[PDB]
């Protein structure tokens, strides 16, 4: 069962890199997939707003920033057939620039 | 003082005639503001506030 858990987790990382690679690159495969399960669908994820994904001092500022960026990445991963990890990486780059700005 | 000032006499009476608008029938006021979907006042079964088309 532990071996099957390992196989299933690696398959989950592959499926996350296939389906939502920009959300995967932005936050992670597993945290993005948890947000997927918390919302219900990537359709609903791109439906909801930045405050909704935020609830879903500078720590809160970083949280709101990453919530807006993950909203945009959910949008592009929902309405792009083949998402661009270049955009995912530059989005994470701006996030890390804000983290360095802290 | 309403008998003194005319427009105020219309003012405080029109709005007095306006609070009674919600009583004679349900009037529109904004919409859904919070997260609540149902009615704060209650739902009934055999009321059927509808007009019939009579032959």
């Amino acid at each position: 069962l532990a071996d099957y858990r390992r196989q299933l987790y690696d398959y989950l990382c592959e499926k996350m890199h296939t389906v939502a690679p920009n959300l995967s690159e932005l936050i992670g495969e597993v945290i993005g997939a948890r947000l997927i399960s918390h919302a219900g669908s990537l359709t609903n994820l791109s439906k909801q707003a930045a405050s909704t994904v935020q609830i879903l001092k500078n720590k809160g500022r970083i949280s709101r920033y990453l919530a807006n960026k993950c909203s945009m990445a959910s949008r592009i991963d929902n309405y792009s057939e083949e998402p661009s990890n270049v955009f995912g990486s530059v989005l994470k780059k701006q996030v890390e620039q804000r983290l360095e700005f802290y | 003082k309403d008998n003194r000032n005319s427009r105020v006499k219309k003012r405080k009476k029109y709005q007095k005639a306006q609070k009674k608008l919600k009583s004679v029938r349900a009037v529109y006021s904004g919409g859904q503001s919070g997260v609540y979907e149902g009615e704060k006042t209650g739902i009934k079964k055999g009321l059927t506030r509808s007009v019939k088309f009579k032959n």
Binding site: - | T48, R49, S50, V51, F53, N55
Partner: protein, 167 residues
């Protein structure tokens, strides 16, 4: 059930005792205002109104235009149409006026020819028309219902009754 037993019973009685439906108020109804009547108007015609308009020799659509200071659209139903068709030969000229591309025919789904019931159903279900008649009992009916413009014929021309925008 004897009468004196009933007498004793009423004396004992005095000595001892001493799914529904509510039609909504229409959304177009401020208290008696009926704000939904703006030009163009939409009017409903009666046989009595037709024949008295012949008698006073007034024009039908020109008459309601000059009486109501704007544009207006005339309507008759199949009940009043069959009522004219039942009146027949003496009012053949009234039938000739009632058949016109400028008057718009309105259909109905009714059993009989009681145009009174037809039209009062229409006004109890719509409250957006203007009734144009001369009849007394129906006049009292449209009077006892509120917030609706009656226009009758009389004198030299037509006369409006309940419309607030008289001028």
């Amino acid at each position: 059930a004897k009468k004196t037993r009933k007498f004793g019973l009423v004396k004992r009685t005095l000595n001892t005792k001493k799914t529904r439906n509510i039609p909504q108020v229409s959304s177009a109804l401020f208290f008696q205002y009926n704000q939904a009547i703006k030009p163009p108007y939409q009017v409903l015609i009666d046989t009595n109104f037709i024949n008295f308009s012949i008698q006073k020799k007034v024009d039908i659509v020109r008459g309601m235009m000059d009486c109501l200071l704007a544009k207006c659209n005339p309507l008759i139903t199949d009940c009043v149409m069959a009522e004219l068709e039942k009146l027949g030969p003496k009012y053949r000229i009234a039938l000739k006026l009632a058949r016109d591309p400028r008057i718009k025919r309105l259909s109905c789904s009714h059993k009989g020819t009681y145009a009174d019931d037809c039209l009062v159903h229409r006004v109890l279900q719509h409250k957006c028309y203007i009734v144009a008649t001369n009849d007394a009992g129906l006049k009292q009916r449209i009077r006892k219902i509120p917030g609706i413009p009656l226009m009758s014929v009389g004198g030299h021309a037509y006369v409006i009754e309940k419309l607030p925008d008289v001028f």
